[PDB]
Write a protein that binds this DNA or RNA. Sequence first.
DNA 1: GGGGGAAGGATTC
DNA 2: CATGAATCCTTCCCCC
Length: 341
Amino acid sequence: MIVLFVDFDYFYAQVEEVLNPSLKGKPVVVCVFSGRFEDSGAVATANYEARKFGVKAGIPIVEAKKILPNAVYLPMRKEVYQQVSSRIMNLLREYSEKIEIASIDEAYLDISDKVRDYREAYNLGLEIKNKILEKEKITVTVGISKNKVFAKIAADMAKPNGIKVIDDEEVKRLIRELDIADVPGIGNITAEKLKKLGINKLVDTLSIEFDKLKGMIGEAKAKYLISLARDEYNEPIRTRVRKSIGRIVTMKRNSRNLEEIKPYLFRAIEESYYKLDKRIPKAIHVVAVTEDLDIVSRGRTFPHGISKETAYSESVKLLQKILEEDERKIRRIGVRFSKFI
DNA sequence: GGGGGAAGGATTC
DNA sequence: CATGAATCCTTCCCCC
Ligand SMILES: Nc1ncnc2c1ncn2[C@H]1CC[C@@H](COP(=O)(O)OP(=O)(O)OP(=O)(O)O)O1
Ligand SMILES: [Ca+2]
Ligand SMILES: [Ca+2]
Ligand SMILES: [Ca+2]
């Protein structure tokens, strides 16, 4: 079992560098402008020139400008990046029949049968890196190891524009030295619950009862961390299928007025249906971000598919339910369609 | 008791 | 100052 994980470097900004080469060398910041006020919004991603100074995804646009008032700030263009992403995704296929597209910029390849080992795999790595670089002018980092989890950790260590392998030998070392937090699927919330338990390393999960681990971080997470530590993690490369489609927007200002919120809600629905393109959902959820950044949601599943007319009237009821069951204002309103026929 | 689903939230990338 | 989606978790609930 050999897995080759491909991760496109600072993807959104790099695509902007490609569509306009004169941006190379300068700090590029791709952000999302919320409408709320002068430069309100967050940074979606930035190139490394910008990351050297603390400007990264997540921080407010207003914060990035204080640090880098002369960097190039560009509005995110998701559609463009998706098409470029797809074209790259179609190149990888040719290197493997078993391909799992994790996200718009990550993918896992089952190259167990394309090679026989870690020399031909590494070589297959460069083979792909160059193919992509020449065809799309995009640099990507490649990680290679026995399973998906370590493959990804390989790229995490290699990026940007790198390629690294983690032989069964080094896997044994990491399962003992690697900060559990750096393990995919382990965010801050989980990384902490693990420290209070004394688990600062993958192996440490072996020195604890499974029942306390289940109790603290959940069964699914417990078995995951344990198998990995036991060095028996072996998840296959599957074809992820879209289970849901939605869209959430930010309002000009918070509010609890149905008539002031509807337009944004309807706009979110219109876009969601456009993206459904032929897909018919039987379930609908209205999602709302409260003034204090809380996420509330009310939904409903129908025994039949949902028409735009139904979604329209139903979303208003779920929005009214939200308001009747939560005093806070709404900062962002949206919808999500699931359970496709 | 326990299957099976639905609803609302928790987490992560 | 704060911008799509999968998976998992907990709580119900209907029911044989
Ligand atoms: N805060 C965000 N807002 C919008 N899109 C985001 C955000 N964070 C990440 N993404 C998207 C765009 C890039 C993609 C990559 O996943 P991830 O952030 O986990 O790896 P990464 O940090 O290597 O990505 P990259 O460097 O290309 O931006 O996910
Ligand atoms: Ca990535
Ligand atoms: Ca990336
Ligand atoms: Ca982490």
